A = this chain, B = another copy of it.
């Protein structure tokens, strides 16, 4: 449980610099791994994860003096690149202990900066941030994956002002004339890399990342996504929208002019209209097959966890279900069952409502579509359950009261009471009962209770309008557009290389060795009228 803990860990925990100094002087092993269950993540038990090492323990506890001693003592220096059983180094541990609170973010940022400076000074040829843990994540990738927006924000626009540490910066100042200055953002492992770019990690999160909506608001990421949109993806997205418009028009035309004789499949007549009809049907089935395979590819690549399946990946599910209805329609069509129509129309309806998928790329319409999606996913079940409880209760009461009437059934009475909700309730739809007072009292009570329900729905949804819905929907729309951008880049359709944006600029030209550093920078201009 406490396996691996030794006196050096105890000394660091108690914040006793003298005891740590004596223990290191007396031959304590500064690389000892406290790999007991207490020192692991272990969400189902109490504990504290810090990287299992004395150096990462000192770093995680905001003890800079002990870190400086351990790294560069006289007897046994600590290995700044050491990895624990998970593969995490000190920087990975510092990312892990972040929780996006103010003081935690401040001290974690400061400790991260100090670790980088000391590592560069002691080991100029060591690139700490390129070291990956057993999951293959760098500290930047780990911060992006875990949603540590504070540490991510610090790293992305990190600028270090001192000699022999410029190469560690990721934000550079290219020039400054007056109040205007032009800065450069590094974008290594953000735009693209071998395994885990920041954009890929954020966009393809599992929806359990706490700040997936907010991480994209960090300046270089938002500007990079807007640039990618305007330069490369806008035209391709509009072309896809146009093609989908043509597909849905052809599907609507083919379905509208279906033959009405029974027993499909139908013989092709030697006439122009039927050649157009069968061509449209073939194109409709082809598009359905295309969306079917696209949905399968998406689900295989992402592997949703059946809870992230719906709160994310919503549009992919809708397109896949549309294709499923299309394929079931084809199977029923060739099975000589008229019921294929029942499938086809559903696909047709879905095929038009999925037009809302393309509202992303338009800020306001995309926000409205996001509101619709989240209302369906979050709020619909609660209100529909309560409304259906009231409807079914009063329908059962009324149909029990009715004796051998025209209605006298759950379906007819439920529909007739539902008509009150749409402003079409008759209120005298039958007289096949005794106790007219009971009938009218039940209907009036149902009407009043239904209006109470709808009024409470309105009030309850108004509780979230205090700046929450607008900003939340806007950020969700931005995330959806980012996902669209990344998918479009992955497809790219013509083996084009212009998707690699921001050009190849020289930051310093003086690395720790005599080589230069071209690092694919992105330029951002800013104006500051104070702090001259």
Contacting pair A368 B346 (CB below 8 A): no
Which of B179, B191, B465 makes the CB contact (< 8 A) with A500? Answer: B191
Contacting pair A469 B524 (CB below 8 A): no
Which of B355, B527, B530 makes the CB contact (< 8 A) with A180? Answer: B527
A327-355 CB contacts (< 8 Å) to partner B: 338-339, 341-342, 344-346, 348-353, 355
Q: Does A69 contact B (CB under 8 A)?
A: no
| Shortest Cβ gap from A213 to chain B (Å) | 4
| Shortest Cβ gap from A464 to chain B (Å) | 8
Contacting pair A469 B463 (CB below 8 A): yes
In the bound complex, residues from chain B placing their C-beta under 8 Å from that of A486 are 199-200, 203-204
Query: Which of the 9-residue segments A71-79, A131-139, A276-284, A509-517 touches chain B?
Result: A509-517
A36-94 CB contacts (< 8 Å) to partner B: 46-48, 50, 60-62
In the bound complex, residues from chain B placing their C-beta under 8 Å from that of A187 are 502, 519-522
In the bound complex, residues from chain B placing their C-beta under 8 Å from that of A481 are 225, 360-361, 366
Which residue in chain B gives the minimum CB-CB distance to A423?
A: B423
| Shortest Cβ gap from A469 to chain B (Å) | 6
Given contacts A48-B180, A61-B179, A370-B476, contact A186 B435 (CB under 8 A): no
In the bound complex, residues from chain B placing their C-beta under 8 Å from that of A445 are 349
Which of B206, B367, B383 makes the CB contact (< 8 A) with A477? Answer: B367
Task: List 19 A-B pairs, Cβ < 8 Å.
Answer: A48-B180, A179-B529, A182-B523, A184-B522, A185-B524, A192-B500, A202-B482, A206-B312, A208-B308, A214-B475, A219-B524, A223-B522, A342-B401, A364-B382, A371-B459, A375-B456, A415-B427, A459-B462, A462-B465
Q: Does A212 contact B (CB under 8 A)?
A: yes
Query: Which of the 9-residue segments A24-32, A119-127, A387-395 touches chain B?
Result: A387-395
In the bound complex, residues from chain B placing their C-beta under 8 Å from that of A206 are 308, 312
In the bound complex, residues from chain B placing their C-beta under 8 Å from that of A479 are 202-203, 212-213, 216
Contacting pair A527 B179 (CB below 8 A): yes
Contacting pair B521 A185 (CB below 8 A): yes
Contacting pair A352 B392 (CB below 8 A): yes
Which of B172, B361, B365, B396 makes the CB contact (< 8 A) with A349? Answer: B396
| Shortest Cβ gap from A359 to chain B (Å) | 8
Q: Does A430 contact B (CB under 8 A)?
A: no
Given contacts A177-B48, A473-B371, contact A505 B184 (CB under 8 A): yes
| Shortest Cβ gap from A321 to chain B (Å) | 13
The 5 closest A-B CB pairs, nearest first, are A352-B393, A423-B423, A184-B521, A213-B475, A349-B397
Contacting pair B203 A394 (CB below 8 A): no
Contacting pair B502 A191 (CB below 8 A): yes
Contacting pair B393 A532 (CB below 8 A): no
In the bound complex, residues from chain B placing their C-beta under 8 Å from that of A223 are 522, 524
Given contacts A220-B522, A527-B179, contact A434 B341 (CB under 8 A): yes
Contacting pair B520 A188 (CB below 8 A): yes
A183-198 CB contacts (< 8 Å) to partner B: 183-188, 191-192
Q: Does A235 contact B (CB under 8 A)?
A: no
Contacting pair B386 A482 (CB below 8 A): no
Contacting pair B179 A528 (CB below 8 A): yes
Contacting pair A478 B216 (CB below 8 A): yes
Contacting pair B422 A422 (CB below 8 A): no
Query: Which of the 9-residue segments A146-154, A265-273, A287-295, A447-455 touches chain B?
Result: A447-455
Contacting pair A396 B255 (CB below 8 A): yes
In the bound complex, residues from chain B placing their C-beta under 8 Å from that of A510 are 166-167
In the bound complex, residues from chain B placing their C-beta under 8 Å from that of A178 are 13, 48, 50, 60-61
Q: Does A406 contact B (CB under 8 A)?
A: no
Contacting pair B529 A101 (CB below 8 A): yes
Which residue in chain B gives the minimum CB-CB distance to A358?
A: B484
Query: Which residue, A185, A351, A393, has most C-beta atoms of chain B within 10 A?
Result: A393
